[PDB]
Structures are given as structure tokens and as C-alpha cells.
Write a protein that binds this ligand. Structure first.
Ligand SMILES: *[C@H]1O[C@H](CO)[C@@H](O)[C@H](O)[C@@H]1O[C@H]1O[C@H](CO)[C@@H](O)[C@H](O)[C@@H]1O
Length: 36
């Protein structure tokens, strides 16, 4: 899973998108979504 404060869903982001249990994937910007 993605770490806390990590990107959880960018458009074209091939890395860890699934937030860790206890973190919310908050889309902050078009490509930047962060596990908060
Ligand atoms: C958490 O770790 C992931 C890799 O294991 C990264 O992909 C994430 O973006 C996230 O890293 C960022 O946030 C953490 C918060 O603890 C910082 O420690 C990292 O340096 C980085 O800024």
C-alpha cells in the first residue's frame, strides 16, 4: 500500500495508489491525490 502522505492516484501514475489502511485517498490536484 501507499504510505501516509503519498500519492494515491495520479493520472498516469503507475506507482502505489492503494492507500494504507487508515488513510484516505484525497484528490488534491488533477494528478496529485494524497493518502491523508
Ligand atoms: C510514503 O512512502 C512512499 C514510498 O514508500 C511514497 O511513495 C509516498 O509518496 C510517501 O512518501 C512521502 O511521504 C512520506 C511521509 O512519511 C515521507 O517520509 C517521504 O519522504 C515522502 O515525502
Amino acid at each position: 500500500t501507499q504510505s501516509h502522505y503519498g500519492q494515491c492516484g495520479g493520472i498516469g501514475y503507475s506507482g502505489p495508489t492503494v492507500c494504507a489502511s487508515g488513510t484516505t485517498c484525497q484528490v488534491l490536484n488533477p494528478y496529485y491525490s494524497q493518502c491523508l
